[PDB]
Amino acid sequence: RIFDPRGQTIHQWNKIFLVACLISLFVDPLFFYLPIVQDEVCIDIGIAVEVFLIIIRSIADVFYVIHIFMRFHTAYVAPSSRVFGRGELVIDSSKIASRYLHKGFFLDFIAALPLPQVLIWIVIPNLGGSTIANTKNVLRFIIIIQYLPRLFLIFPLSSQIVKATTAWAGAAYNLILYMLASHVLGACWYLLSIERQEACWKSVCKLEESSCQFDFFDCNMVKDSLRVSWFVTSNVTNLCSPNSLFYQFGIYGDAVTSKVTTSAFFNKYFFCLWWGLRNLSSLGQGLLTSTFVGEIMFAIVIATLGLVLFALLIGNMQTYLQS
Amino acid sequence: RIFDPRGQTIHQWNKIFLVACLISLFVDPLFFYLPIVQDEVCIDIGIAVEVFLIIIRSIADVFYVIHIFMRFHTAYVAPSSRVFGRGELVIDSSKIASRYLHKGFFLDFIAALPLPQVLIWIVIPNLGGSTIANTKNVLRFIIIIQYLPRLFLIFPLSSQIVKATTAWAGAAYNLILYMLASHVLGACWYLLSIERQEACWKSVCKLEESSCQFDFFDCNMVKDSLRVSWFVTSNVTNLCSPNSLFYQFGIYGDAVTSKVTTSAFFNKYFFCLWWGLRNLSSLGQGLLTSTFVGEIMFAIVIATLGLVLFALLIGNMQTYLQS
Amino acid sequence: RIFDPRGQTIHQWNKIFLVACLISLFVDPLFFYLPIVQDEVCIDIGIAVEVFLIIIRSIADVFYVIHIFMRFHTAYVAPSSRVFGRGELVIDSSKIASRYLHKGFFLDFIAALPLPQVLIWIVIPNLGGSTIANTKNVLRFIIIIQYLPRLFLIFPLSSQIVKATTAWAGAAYNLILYMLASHVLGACWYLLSIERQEACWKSVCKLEESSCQFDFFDCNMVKDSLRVSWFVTSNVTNLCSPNSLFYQFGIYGDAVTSKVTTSAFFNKYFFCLWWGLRNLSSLGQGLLTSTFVGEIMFAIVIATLGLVLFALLIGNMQTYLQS
Amino acid sequence: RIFDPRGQTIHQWNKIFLVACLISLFVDPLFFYLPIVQDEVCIDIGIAVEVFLIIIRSIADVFYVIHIFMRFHTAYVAPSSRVFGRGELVIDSSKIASRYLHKGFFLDFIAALPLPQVLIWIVIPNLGGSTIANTKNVLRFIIIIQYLPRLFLIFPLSSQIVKATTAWAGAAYNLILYMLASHVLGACWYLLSIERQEACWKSVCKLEESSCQFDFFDCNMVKDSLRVSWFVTSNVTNLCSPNSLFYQFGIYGDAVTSKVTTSAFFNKYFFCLWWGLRNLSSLGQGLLTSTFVGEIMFAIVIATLGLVLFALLIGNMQTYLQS
């Protein structure tokens, strides 16, 4: 059942797979919005939203597995058989599999690994208790390690769609990509702000090591008598604010003053998407960072992305107007 | 009395209609500047300015009715008779009316409906008392529901004018588009800031529900003894300020600190026009919103409009310089 | 002694006239830096800098008069005698004078009028004592009335210089124009901030009509016994500051906090030039104006100039790299 | 042993020399990050990082000397022997040396001088004790005096590499130049902020001439009894802050508020790099300077560099899109 590379089944499958990849690209950064900072100073996770996102990601991974299957069952054109553009067809399944494994299979398999799901379920909780690591909100960012190759996969595939079927197709696509970059940067900023607030809490606990340890900032122990007794005699709610000059919050300060980390899922999502869009359009200006290397590099990445994306938008609109 | 589409009567009518549509597009957002926040914490409406705007709107409406009447009596080129461009003319009134009804009549009829003057006069006040809704200043935005179709009519019609009559007509036209977009965004910002201040007043009333009720911020009840007795012992004047953290004013806070909602019509109009133009040139930067989805979406729309308009301006200037 | 329009004497005269026009365009805005706000809350005029600028403007006006004389004594090509480019020359002095008077003489004569000199010397002081008007700092802006036609003369003449003698000639020329716009806008902003501070002083005087009148803010009367007695008991020092919420300084408030109205000529000049450059590059963003129509219109003009200039710069660099 | 100008040895040497020159351009501004402001209000020099930078710069200068020595022994195409491209080879060493001395030797020699390490070792300390000058942290900027000619050598030489080896070579090259400009501007801003804080300390000492001289702000005298006695009774810590309105810190105040001058080398380097990149992308907006001419000139230079770099980047991206 080898499908023709320039046939109809593969064209329809690629049309569906572009939508599936776009859905996966949209859903992956949403995993960064799960942590919630509560008024009692603790980080919880929205269970219902977590399960919903995991279900969507599982559907996307099923689609990716189907794509890998169809790529093991697709034909190719031999480079040496290209007779005036007529490269014929190859039906050898073994040759197709060898060609796929030599080039293309590795990156597609990496992109199809259910990394967020295993990280959420069978890595952090249950037997894989990372008490020694104590970086539950940091490991989520390794999704980016898988997100970056997957983002690459959107470039050639969509190009094939361009071959499948203009003036309006150069600016709308670039604005969609620009919104995607804004979405990813906003989710990254939200998770980094959560990490910054957790670091401020850890510094406060270090200042108050007499009656605190690095276990009081989890909402599963908020009702403990020790937790409330420490909370009523601590000024963590006032020290961990951008107004107080105790900890350098930097660009993450807007996540504490505006209570973004406490707001509902849609409020926080739209706030962070607008943050990313605004700091991508403004070329990273207004990102008055602290003296921390990671935040500075995040701001530099945002500025560079804004520069290249604005240049692409200007060029695309110039091309559209000239044609 | 069928008019020639390429003739002189229709050309002159289109020249008049371009100016009429430009005036109508300039006047429609001005209805958002009518509400006035007075020093007694209430929202009034300038009766004289409202009457003048309704008169101008009715003039635009009768011009649109004349345009519809004229288009009911215009000839069209038969697609099947296009013999090397010479498509002749169709004179049959019934055929012309049927063709116009099939394509074109609905969208032109929508743009000619006197929706704003109906809403102001015979929808909200008098028989149609919307006491339950209590959203008098929110219904105005449904003018946008009609504004967007009308904004469409400029693009073809002006192009037709281009056919009727370059290097200087590309940058100036896009600057006019920029002015119109900034004016509309400024009017929308003014009305949304009025809504935000009214929402803060409603929150204060809820906090003081013992002596306040949800009909109490109307200027027709200012002289009431109950209202003054409540006001002399109420802290609504400082709770609904961006300085206080009682309510998240966000980007609308600049309309409370600067007191544009209480200024004269020209001052408020120019302030809001400059606000829209500045946040369109800054690509939405400086729009530090709150965690409210509507305000965030407004900021995102402003940033996207700034992106597309600046890209169009750069492309038009590049075309001008290359020509 | 009619000179050849395609000859060498007129070529050299145009080369030196471009320099003279550039110097005159650089010098006219400097007259806006003359008023100085002193620590005694008064506005004085720097006599030495004023005299130097008047001398430079006199030299420029002499050059302009020589230019208009030479234009009265230059030949022209008859439009009806253009036989395949060989349009011959016209030597009749009467015909040349009539042609110049019909078109060209009016605006050239307008630019050659010593308006700033007569305004400074024989309009405001001496016989023309503007005691009733009391707007000495406002009249200077009618230099702009002469400045706008003069700025016109740069555009054709420079093009003629192009005909006298590339890839590098597009970016540098546009940067020179951009610097000129920044210089003019900075001088205008300095004078407007002077006017705003004087208006705040007048408002304070109105608040203190018992012991103040509209002369007390003139530095010639600073040593008056009434002046010192009012000053030792007046709070105009802190009331007219952007920190206090007494007067809406707006975008001009930055000139009071930084004390640029008091500093030396070089400091204030460079601060205002950088202000114009920054608010021209930032597309007018950060110009958070008050509810005053004049300030808002000035900010709108600055933003539109920034838009057109940045688009022109982008287009010029695109042309330079492409060619 | 004259090398062929279009041979293989010179090609490889130029490939090495481009990397060497890039290293030298990256290392020279790092000398500006050496001064450190300590909590005892004094400026020290990191000896270890200074020695490492001196060693790297010495290696780069040895590479420059090797380049000069070898290009003394290369043939050149005779201007009069260019017979249809075949310009032959000049083997005469005397003629090659004469041509090099006439054109090429001066700029290559001035760019190979060990001026930075000479200043660090045998100019400022030891015999050349600049007690009278008292500009230990100011002289470093004369590295820029040699840096600009060395910045020139990149533009031709890199072009040769282009001749030795596209669509991706326009955006990447522009971004490399842009990052280099950001790095240089950040180093210059750090050293200028150090200078501003030192000037504030000098002003404070002038305010405290009774018990202070211009030596208490050197970290070699921090442990002196007079030093500690003055420090315990001096308020230099409060007066020399951006919050206190004592000294106009201007755009350098962000360096004191963020305590970047005290941070470690990596923190300060990345903070200053992000500062330069942000103020270069923002076209100098947000550089609210003081009334000081040097700071204003620095801001104007930053704005002009941002303008030209953004224009070049837009043009390069347009070229990439169209080709």
Numbering used by the authors:
A (entry chain D), B (entry chain C), C (entry chain B), D (entry chain A): 58 to 222, 228 to 385
Can I see the authors' text?
Cyclic nucleotide-gated ion channels (CNGCs) in plants mediate Ca2+ influx in response to environmental changes. Among numerous plant CNGCs, Medicago truncatula CNGC15a/b/c (MtCNGC15) is localized to the nuclear envelope. The MtCNGC15 was reported to be activated after the sensing of Nod factors and negatively regulated by camodulin (CaM) to fullfil a cycle of Ca2+ release and retrieve between the endoplasmic reticulum/nuclear envelop lumen and the nucleoplasm.
The transmembrane domains (TM) and CPD of the MtCNGC15b show contrasting features in the density map. The ion conduction pathway of MtCNGC15b consists of the selectivity filter (SF) in pore loops and the inner gate formed by S6. The SF of MtCNGC15b comprises residues Ser344-Gln347. The side chains of Gln347 restrict the permeation path, differing from a glutamic acid in reported animal CNG ion channels like TAX-4 and human CNGA1. Substitution of Gln347 to Glu abolished the Ca2+ currents, suggesting the indispensable role of Gln347 in Ca2+ recognition. Different from animal CNG channels, three pairs of disulfide bonds — Cys99/Cys281, Cys262/Cys302, and Cys267/Cys274 on MtCNGC15b is mapped to the nuclear envelop lumen side. Notably, the Cys99/Cys281 pair forms a bridge between the VSD and the PD of MtCNGC15b. Given that the lumenal environment is likely oxidative, these disulfide bonds may play a physiological role in regulating the coupling between the VSD and PD.
